[PDB]
CSV table of C-alpha atoms and ligand atoms in Angstrom, one decimal:
chain,number,residue,atom,x,y,z
A,29,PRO,CA,-74.2,38.8,-24.8
A,30,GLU,CA,-74.2,35.4,-22.9
A,31,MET,CA,-71.1,34.5,-20.7
A,32,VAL,CA,-69.5,31.1,-20.1
A,33,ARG,CA,-66.8,30.7,-17.2
A,34,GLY,CA,-66.3,34.6,-17.3
A,35,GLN,CA,-65.8,34.6,-21.1
A,36,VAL,CA,-67.8,36.3,-23.9
A,37,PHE,CA,-69.5,33.4,-25.7
A,38,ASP,CA,-71.7,35.4,-28.0
A,39,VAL,CA,-73.7,33.2,-30.2
A,40,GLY,CA,-77.4,33.9,-29.6
A,41,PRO,CA,-80.3,34.5,-30.0
A,42,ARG,CA,-80.2,31.4,-32.3
A,43,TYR,CA,-78.1,29.3,-29.9
A,44,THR,CA,-79.2,29.3,-26.2
A,45,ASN,CA,-78.7,27.3,-23.0
A,46,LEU,CA,-74.9,27.0,-23.4
A,47,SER,CA,-73.2,24.0,-21.6
A,48,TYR,CA,-69.5,24.2,-21.5
A,49,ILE,CA,-68.0,21.0,-23.2
A,50,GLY,CA,-64.2,21.9,-22.9
A,51,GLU,CA,-61.4,23.5,-24.8
A,52,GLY,CA,-59.8,22.5,-28.1
A,53,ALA,CA,-58.3,24.0,-31.3
A,54,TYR,CA,-58.2,27.8,-30.4
A,55,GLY,CA,-60.2,27.9,-27.2
A,56,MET,CA,-63.6,27.5,-25.7
A,57,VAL,CA,-66.3,25.1,-26.9
A,58,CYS,CA,-69.9,24.8,-25.6
A,59,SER,CA,-72.9,22.7,-26.7
A,60,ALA,CA,-76.0,24.9,-27.3
A,61,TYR,CA,-79.6,24.3,-28.3
A,62,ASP,CA,-80.0,25.4,-31.9
A,63,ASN,CA,-83.3,27.0,-31.9
A,64,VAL,CA,-83.9,26.6,-35.8
A,65,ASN,CA,-83.1,23.0,-36.3
A,66,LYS,CA,-84.2,22.1,-32.7
A,67,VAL,CA,-81.2,19.9,-31.8
A,68,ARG,CA,-78.2,20.6,-29.6
A,69,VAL,CA,-75.0,21.6,-31.7
A,70,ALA,CA,-71.2,22.1,-30.8
A,71,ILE,CA,-69.8,25.8,-31.1
A,72,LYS,CA,-66.2,26.5,-31.0
A,73,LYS,CA,-65.0,30.2,-30.2
A,74,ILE,CA,-62.1,31.2,-32.4
A,75,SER,CA,-60.0,34.4,-31.7
A,76,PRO,CA,-57.1,34.3,-34.2
A,77,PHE,CA,-56.7,37.8,-35.7
A,78,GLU,CA,-53.6,38.9,-33.6
A,79,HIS,CA,-51.4,36.0,-34.9
A,80,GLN,CA,-50.5,35.0,-38.6
A,81,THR,CA,-50.3,31.2,-37.8
A,82,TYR,CA,-53.6,31.4,-36.0
A,83,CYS,CA,-55.3,33.1,-39.0
A,84,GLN,CA,-53.7,30.7,-41.5
A,85,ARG,CA,-54.8,27.6,-39.6
A,86,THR,CA,-58.3,29.0,-39.1
A,87,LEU,CA,-58.7,30.0,-42.8
A,88,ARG,CA,-57.4,26.7,-44.0
A,89,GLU,CA,-59.8,24.8,-41.8
A,90,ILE,CA,-62.8,26.9,-43.0
A,91,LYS,CA,-62.0,26.8,-46.7
A,92,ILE,CA,-61.5,23.0,-46.6
A,93,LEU,CA,-64.5,22.2,-44.5
A,94,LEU,CA,-66.9,24.4,-46.5
A,95,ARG,CA,-65.7,22.7,-49.8
A,96,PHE,CA,-66.0,19.2,-48.3
A,97,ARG,CA,-69.1,17.2,-48.2
A,98,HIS,CA,-68.9,13.8,-46.6
A,99,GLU,CA,-70.6,11.6,-43.9
A,100,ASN,CA,-67.2,10.9,-42.2
A,101,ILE,CA,-65.9,14.6,-42.2
A,102,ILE,CA,-67.3,17.1,-39.7
A,103,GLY,CA,-69.2,19.8,-41.6
A,104,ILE,CA,-69.6,23.5,-40.8
A,105,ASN,CA,-73.4,24.1,-40.1
A,106,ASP,CA,-73.1,27.8,-39.4
A,107,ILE,CA,-70.5,30.5,-38.7
A,108,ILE,CA,-71.2,33.5,-36.3
A,109,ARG,CA,-69.4,36.7,-36.6
A,110,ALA,CA,-69.8,40.5,-36.6
A,111,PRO,CA,-71.2,42.1,-39.8
A,112,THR,CA,-68.2,44.1,-40.6
A,113,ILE,CA,-64.4,43.5,-40.6
A,114,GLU,CA,-63.9,46.3,-38.1
A,115,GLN,CA,-66.2,44.9,-35.6
A,116,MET,CA,-65.2,41.1,-36.2
A,117,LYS,CA,-63.0,40.0,-33.2
A,118,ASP,CA,-64.2,36.4,-32.8
A,119,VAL,CA,-65.7,33.7,-35.0
A,120,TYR,CA,-67.9,30.9,-33.8
A,121,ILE,CA,-67.9,27.7,-35.8
A,122,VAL,CA,-71.3,25.6,-35.3
A,123,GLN,CA,-71.0,21.9,-36.0
A,124,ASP,CA,-73.0,18.7,-35.4
A,125,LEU,CA,-72.7,17.7,-31.7
A,126,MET,CA,-70.6,14.7,-31.3
A,127,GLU,CA,-70.7,13.5,-27.8
A,128,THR,CA,-67.2,12.0,-27.7
A,129,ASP,CA,-64.0,11.3,-29.6
A,130,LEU,CA,-61.6,8.4,-30.1
A,131,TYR,CA,-59.1,9.7,-27.5
A,132,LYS,CA,-61.7,9.9,-24.8
A,133,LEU,CA,-63.1,6.5,-25.8
A,134,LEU,CA,-59.7,4.7,-25.7
A,135,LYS,CA,-58.8,6.1,-22.3
A,136,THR,CA,-62.0,4.5,-20.9
A,137,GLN,CA,-63.6,1.8,-23.0
A,138,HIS,CA,-62.4,-1.6,-24.4
A,139,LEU,CA,-63.3,-1.7,-28.2
A,140,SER,CA,-64.7,-5.0,-29.6
A,141,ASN,CA,-63.3,-6.3,-32.8
A,142,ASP,CA,-66.6,-5.3,-34.4
A,143,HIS,CA,-66.2,-1.6,-33.2
A,144,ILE,CA,-62.4,-1.5,-34.4
A,145,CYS,CA,-63.4,-2.7,-37.7
A,146,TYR,CA,-66.3,-0.2,-38.0
A,147,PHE,CA,-64.2,2.7,-36.8
A,148,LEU,CA,-61.3,1.8,-39.1
A,149,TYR,CA,-63.7,1.5,-42.1
A,150,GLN,CA,-65.2,5.1,-41.5
A,151,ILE,CA,-61.7,6.6,-40.9
A,152,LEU,CA,-60.6,5.1,-44.3
A,153,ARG,CA,-63.9,6.0,-46.0
A,154,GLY,CA,-63.4,9.7,-44.8
A,155,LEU,CA,-59.7,9.7,-45.8
A,156,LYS,CA,-60.5,8.3,-49.4
A,157,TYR,CA,-62.5,11.5,-49.9
A,158,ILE,CA,-59.9,13.8,-48.5
A,159,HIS,CA,-57.1,12.1,-50.6
A,160,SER,CA,-59.3,12.2,-53.7
A,161,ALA,CA,-59.4,16.1,-53.3
A,162,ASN,CA,-55.5,16.1,-53.3
A,163,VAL,CA,-55.6,17.1,-49.7
A,164,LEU,CA,-53.5,15.7,-46.8
A,165,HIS,CA,-54.9,15.9,-43.3
A,166,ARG,CA,-51.4,15.6,-41.7
A,167,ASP,CA,-52.6,15.4,-38.0
A,168,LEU,CA,-54.9,12.2,-37.8
A,169,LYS,CA,-54.9,11.0,-34.2
A,170,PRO,CA,-57.6,9.8,-31.9
A,171,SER,CA,-58.6,13.2,-30.5
A,172,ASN,CA,-59.4,14.3,-34.1
A,173,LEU,CA,-61.9,11.5,-34.6
A,174,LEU,CA,-65.2,12.6,-33.4
A,175,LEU,CA,-67.9,10.1,-32.5
A,176,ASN,CA,-71.6,10.3,-31.6
A,177,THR,CA,-73.8,8.1,-29.5
A,178,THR,CA,-74.4,5.7,-32.4
A,179,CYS,CA,-70.7,5.4,-33.1
A,180,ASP,CA,-70.8,7.5,-36.4
A,181,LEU,CA,-67.3,8.6,-36.9
A,182,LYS,CA,-66.2,12.0,-38.3
A,183,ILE,CA,-62.8,13.4,-39.0
A,184,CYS,CA,-61.9,16.9,-37.9
A,185,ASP,CA,-59.4,19.4,-37.4
A,186,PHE,CA,-57.8,20.4,-40.9
A,187,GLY,CA,-55.7,23.2,-39.5
A,188,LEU,CA,-52.5,21.4,-40.5
A,189,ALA,CA,-53.8,20.2,-43.9
A,190,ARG,CA,-52.0,20.8,-47.2
A,191,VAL,CA,-52.4,20.2,-50.8
A,192,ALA,CA,-50.3,17.1,-51.8
A,193,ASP,CA,-46.9,17.9,-53.4
A,194,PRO,CA,-44.9,14.7,-53.8
A,195,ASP,CA,-42.3,16.3,-56.1
A,196,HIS,CA,-41.4,18.6,-53.2
A,197,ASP,CA,-41.4,16.2,-50.3
A,198,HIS,CA,-37.7,15.9,-50.0
A,199,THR,CA,-35.8,17.4,-47.1
A,200,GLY,CA,-32.8,16.8,-44.8
A,201,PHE,CA,-32.4,14.8,-41.7
A,202,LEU,CA,-34.0,16.1,-38.4
A,203,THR,CA,-36.2,18.7,-40.2
A,204,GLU,CA,-38.6,20.3,-37.6
A,205,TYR,CA,-42.2,19.3,-38.1
A,206,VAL,CA,-45.6,20.5,-36.7
A,207,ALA,CA,-48.0,17.6,-36.6
A,208,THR,CA,-48.5,15.3,-33.4
A,209,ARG,CA,-45.4,13.4,-32.5
A,210,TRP,CA,-46.7,9.8,-31.8
A,211,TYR,CA,-48.7,9.6,-35.2
A,212,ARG,CA,-45.5,10.8,-37.4
A,213,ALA,CA,-44.3,8.6,-40.0
A,214,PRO,CA,-40.5,7.6,-39.7
A,215,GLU,CA,-39.7,9.4,-43.0
A,216,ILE,CA,-40.6,12.8,-41.2
A,217,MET,CA,-37.5,12.4,-39.1
A,218,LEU,CA,-35.3,11.2,-42.0
A,219,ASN,CA,-36.1,12.9,-45.4
A,220,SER,CA,-39.8,13.9,-45.8
A,221,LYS,CA,-41.9,17.2,-45.4
A,222,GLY,CA,-45.1,15.2,-45.1
A,223,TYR,CA,-46.3,16.2,-48.5
A,224,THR,CA,-47.6,12.9,-49.7
A,225,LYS,CA,-50.8,10.7,-49.0
A,226,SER,CA,-48.6,8.1,-47.4
A,227,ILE,CA,-48.1,10.3,-44.4
A,228,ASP,CA,-51.8,10.0,-43.4
A,229,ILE,CA,-51.8,6.1,-43.9
A,230,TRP,CA,-49.0,5.8,-41.3
A,231,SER,CA,-51.2,7.8,-38.8
A,232,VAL,CA,-54.1,5.6,-39.4
A,233,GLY,CA,-51.9,2.5,-38.9
A,234,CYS,CA,-50.9,4.1,-35.6
A,235,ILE,CA,-54.6,4.6,-34.7
A,236,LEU,CA,-55.4,0.9,-35.5
A,237,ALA,CA,-52.7,-0.2,-33.3
A,238,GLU,CA,-54.0,1.9,-30.4
A,239,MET,CA,-57.5,0.7,-30.9
A,240,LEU,CA,-56.2,-2.9,-30.6
A,241,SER,CA,-54.5,-2.3,-27.2
A,242,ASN,CA,-55.9,1.3,-25.8
A,243,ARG,CA,-52.3,2.4,-25.7
A,244,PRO,CA,-50.4,4.4,-28.3
A,245,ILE,CA,-48.0,2.1,-30.2
A,246,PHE,CA,-45.1,4.6,-30.5
A,247,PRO,CA,-45.2,7.0,-27.4
A,248,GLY,CA,-42.0,8.8,-28.3
A,249,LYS,CA,-40.9,11.6,-25.8
A,250,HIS,CA,-39.3,13.9,-28.2
A,251,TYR,CA,-38.3,14.3,-31.8
A,252,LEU,CA,-35.6,11.6,-32.4
A,253,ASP,CA,-37.1,9.2,-29.7
A,254,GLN,CA,-40.3,8.9,-32.0
A,255,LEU,CA,-37.9,7.0,-34.6
A,256,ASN,CA,-36.3,4.9,-31.6
A,257,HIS,CA,-39.9,3.7,-30.9
A,258,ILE,CA,-40.8,2.9,-34.6
A,259,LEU,CA,-37.5,1.0,-35.1
A,260,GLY,CA,-38.1,-1.0,-31.7
A,261,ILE,CA,-41.1,-2.6,-33.3
A,262,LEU,CA,-40.5,-2.7,-37.1
A,263,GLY,CA,-36.8,-3.5,-36.6
A,264,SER,CA,-33.9,-2.3,-38.8
A,265,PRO,CA,-34.8,-1.3,-42.3
A,266,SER,CA,-33.8,-3.6,-45.2
A,267,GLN,CA,-30.9,-2.7,-47.4
A,268,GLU,CA,-33.5,-1.9,-50.3
A,269,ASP,CA,-35.4,0.5,-47.9
A,270,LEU,CA,-32.1,2.2,-46.8
A,271,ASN,CA,-31.1,2.7,-50.4
A,272,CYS,CA,-34.3,4.5,-50.9
A,273,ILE,CA,-32.9,7.3,-48.6
A,274,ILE,CA,-30.5,9.2,-50.6
A,275,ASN,CA,-29.6,11.8,-47.9
A,276,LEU,CA,-26.4,10.8,-46.2
A,277,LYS,CA,-26.9,12.1,-42.7
A,278,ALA,CA,-30.3,10.3,-42.7
A,279,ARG,CA,-28.9,7.0,-44.2
A,280,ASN,CA,-25.7,7.1,-42.0
A,281,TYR,CA,-27.9,7.6,-38.8
A,282,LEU,CA,-29.8,4.5,-39.6
A,283,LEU,CA,-26.6,2.6,-40.4
A,284,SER,CA,-25.1,3.6,-37.0
A,285,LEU,CA,-27.9,1.8,-35.0
A,286,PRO,CA,-27.4,-1.7,-33.7
A,287,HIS,CA,-29.5,-4.4,-35.5
A,288,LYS,CA,-33.0,-4.6,-34.2
A,289,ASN,CA,-35.3,-7.5,-35.0
A,290,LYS,CA,-39.1,-7.0,-35.9
A,291,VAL,CA,-41.5,-7.6,-33.0
A,292,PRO,CA,-44.2,-9.9,-34.5
A,293,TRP,CA,-47.6,-8.1,-34.4
A,294,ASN,CA,-49.3,-11.2,-33.0
A,295,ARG,CA,-47.0,-10.9,-29.9
A,296,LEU,CA,-47.8,-7.2,-29.5
A,297,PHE,CA,-51.6,-7.9,-30.0
A,298,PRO,CA,-52.2,-11.5,-28.9
A,299,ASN,CA,-56.1,-10.9,-28.9
A,300,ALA,CA,-56.2,-9.2,-32.4
A,301,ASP,CA,-58.1,-10.4,-35.4
A,302,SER,CA,-55.4,-11.8,-37.8
A,303,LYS,CA,-56.9,-9.8,-40.8
A,304,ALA,CA,-56.5,-6.7,-38.7
A,305,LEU,CA,-52.8,-7.4,-38.1
A,306,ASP,CA,-52.2,-8.0,-41.8
A,307,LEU,CA,-53.8,-4.6,-42.7
A,308,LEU,CA,-51.8,-2.9,-39.8
A,309,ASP,CA,-48.5,-4.4,-41.1
A,310,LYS,CA,-49.3,-2.8,-44.5
A,311,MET,CA,-50.2,0.5,-43.2
A,312,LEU,CA,-47.0,0.6,-40.8
A,313,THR,CA,-44.7,-0.1,-43.5
A,314,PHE,CA,-41.3,1.6,-43.2
A,315,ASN,CA,-40.8,2.6,-46.8
A,316,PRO,CA,-43.5,5.1,-47.7
A,317,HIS,CA,-43.4,3.9,-51.4
A,318,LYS,CA,-44.3,0.4,-50.2
A,319,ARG,CA,-46.9,1.7,-47.8
A,320,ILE,CA,-50.7,0.7,-48.7
A,321,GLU,CA,-52.9,3.4,-50.2
A,322,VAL,CA,-56.3,4.3,-48.7
A,323,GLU,CA,-58.3,2.7,-51.6
A,324,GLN,CA,-56.2,-0.6,-51.1
A,325,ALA,CA,-56.9,-0.5,-47.3
A,326,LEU,CA,-60.6,-0.1,-47.9
A,327,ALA,CA,-60.4,-3.4,-50.2
A,328,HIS,CA,-58.4,-5.3,-47.6
A,329,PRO,CA,-60.3,-8.6,-46.3
A,330,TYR,CA,-60.4,-7.1,-42.7
A,331,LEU,CA,-63.0,-4.6,-44.1
A,332,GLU,CA,-65.0,-7.1,-46.4
A,333,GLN,CA,-68.2,-6.6,-44.5
A,334,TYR,CA,-68.3,-3.0,-45.2
A,335,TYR,CA,-66.2,-2.5,-48.5
A,336,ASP,CA,-68.5,-1.0,-51.2
A,337,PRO,CA,-66.6,1.5,-53.5
A,338,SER,CA,-69.8,2.7,-54.9
A,339,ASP,CA,-70.8,3.9,-51.4
A,340,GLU,CA,-67.3,5.4,-50.8
A,341,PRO,CA,-67.5,8.8,-52.6
A,342,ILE,CA,-64.8,11.0,-54.0
A,343,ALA,CA,-64.5,14.9,-54.2
A,344,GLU,CA,-66.0,16.4,-57.3
A,345,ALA,CA,-62.8,18.3,-57.9
A,346,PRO,CA,-59.2,18.7,-56.5
A,347,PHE,CA,-58.6,21.4,-54.0
A,348,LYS,CA,-56.2,24.2,-54.5
A,349,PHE,CA,-55.4,27.3,-52.2
A,350,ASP,CA,-56.0,30.4,-54.2
A,351,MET,CA,-52.6,31.9,-52.8
A,352,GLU,CA,-49.8,30.6,-50.9
A,353,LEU,CA,-51.3,31.3,-47.3
A,354,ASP,CA,-47.9,31.0,-45.7
A,355,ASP,CA,-46.7,34.5,-46.7
A,356,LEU,CA,-49.9,36.6,-46.4
A,357,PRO,CA,-50.2,39.4,-43.8
A,358,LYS,CA,-52.7,38.9,-41.0
A,359,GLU,CA,-54.9,41.9,-42.3
A,360,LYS,CA,-55.2,40.2,-45.7
A,361,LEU,CA,-56.0,36.8,-43.6
A,362,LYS,CA,-58.7,38.6,-41.4
A,363,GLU,CA,-60.1,39.9,-44.6
A,364,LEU,CA,-60.0,36.5,-46.3
A,365,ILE,CA,-61.7,34.8,-43.3
A,366,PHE,CA,-64.4,37.6,-43.4
A,367,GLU,CA,-65.1,36.7,-47.1
A,368,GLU,CA,-65.0,33.0,-46.7
A,369,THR,CA,-67.7,33.2,-43.8
A,370,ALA,CA,-70.0,35.7,-45.6
A,371,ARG,CA,-72.4,33.0,-46.9
A,372,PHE,CA,-73.8,32.5,-43.3
A,373,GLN,CA,-74.9,36.1,-42.9
A,374,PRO,CA,-78.4,37.6,-43.3
B,402,LIG,C1,-61.8,18.2,-34.1
B,402,LIG,C2,-61.0,18.0,-32.9
B,402,LIG,C3,-61.7,18.1,-31.6
B,402,LIG,O1,-62.8,18.7,-31.5
B,402,LIG,N1,-61.2,17.5,-30.5
B,402,LIG,C4,-61.4,17.8,-29.1
B,402,LIG,C5,-61.4,18.9,-28.7
B,402,LIG,C6,-61.6,19.3,-27.3
B,402,LIG,C7,-61.7,18.1,-26.5
B,402,LIG,N2,-61.7,16.9,-26.9
B,402,LIG,C8,-61.5,16.7,-28.2
B,403,LIG,C1,-64.0,20.3,-26.5
B,403,LIG,C2,-64.7,19.4,-27.2
B,403,LIG,C3,-65.3,19.7,-28.5
B,403,LIG,O1,-64.8,20.5,-29.3
B,403,LIG,N1,-66.4,19.0,-29.0
B,403,LIG,C4,-67.1,18.8,-30.1
B,403,LIG,C5,-66.5,19.2,-31.3
B,403,LIG,C6,-67.1,19.3,-32.4
B,403,LIG,C7,-68.4,18.5,-32.5
B,403,LIG,N2,-68.9,18.0,-31.4
B,403,LIG,C8,-68.1,18.1,-30.2
C-alpha cells in the first residue's frame, strides 16, 4: 500500500505516481496517474466512520454527485474501498483533476471582465441544474469552484446540501448556522434556516463581487458582524422589507440600528462593467423574495454572449433523500455508504 507524507493512501494499482496536492473536505488529496483512462486524476481520502456528522456529509455528497450529471458540476469517476463493510475504513473518491480553484485564483490573479463573465455564466449554469433537482448547495464560495487550465468551472462540495423546503424555512433570530460565514445571506442571521434557493443566489452575488475586486465583499469576523458588513453596503432595509420580517427580536434588532445609506456599487467597483453591477444588485437584494432567481440571472444582459436555455440543462427528476439522514446511527450510515459505492466494485 502506497504512502504519502507518512499516511496510508491506498488507491493502486490503477492509480500510481501519487503527488500530494493538499488537504480539503475530510483530509488528504493527491493527484495520481489513472492507468486505465491515461490521464492524471484527483483522489481524495475520506475517513468518516467514527463520527455521525462525517458520515452524514460523506453520504450526502456521494448520493448527490452520483445522481448529478452536468458539465459545471464535479463528477465522481471512481470510488475505492474495501470489499466488505468489516474491512472498509477509508473511502477514496476519484474525480477529474482540476488544477486550481477560484479561491487560489483570486488570491493571485486579476480577472478580465471576459473571465468574470464566463466564470459567472458557468456558476449559474451549474446552479440551474442543482436547483432544477430541488437541491440547495448551501456552501457556495470561491474554494468550492474548481477550474482547470482552460478555465472550465465545476462546482464541488455538496456536504452541506439539502433538498429545498421553503414551507419550513422560518426560524428565530440569531439561529446558529453551518455554512461559510462571508457568503451567508442576511436572512440566515434574522429568520431563515437556508432552506430556499435564494440562499445560493446570495452566495453567487458575493462571489461575483469578489471576482470584481479580488477581496470578499462582506468579511465578517463572527456571526452578527456578518450582518453589520451587509448593512454597511446595502444600507438600512426599507419599511416594506422590514415588514416581511414578522419575528419581533429580528425586526427590533434592525429597528435599533442607526440609519445607513446604500454604498453605490459603481463606487465600490469603479472598474466594473455596468451590466455586471446591475446583475450584482439583483443577486444581493436584502429581501430574499425580491432576489433574482437562477434562470432570471442567466437571462440578464450581462450574460447575453453565453445565454442559451436549450444548452442549460435541467435534472431529469427532483432529488429526495430516502430517509432523514440527520437521525441515522453511524453503523447504518457506514452501511449506506458501502451500498452507495457498490457500483464501482469488480
Ligand atoms: C470541492 C472543494 C475543493 O476541492 N476545494 C479545495 C480543497 C483543497 C484545497 N483547495 C481547494
Ligand atoms: C486539495 C485540493 C483538491 O482537492 N484538489 C482537487 C479536487 C478535485 C479535483 N481536482 C483537484
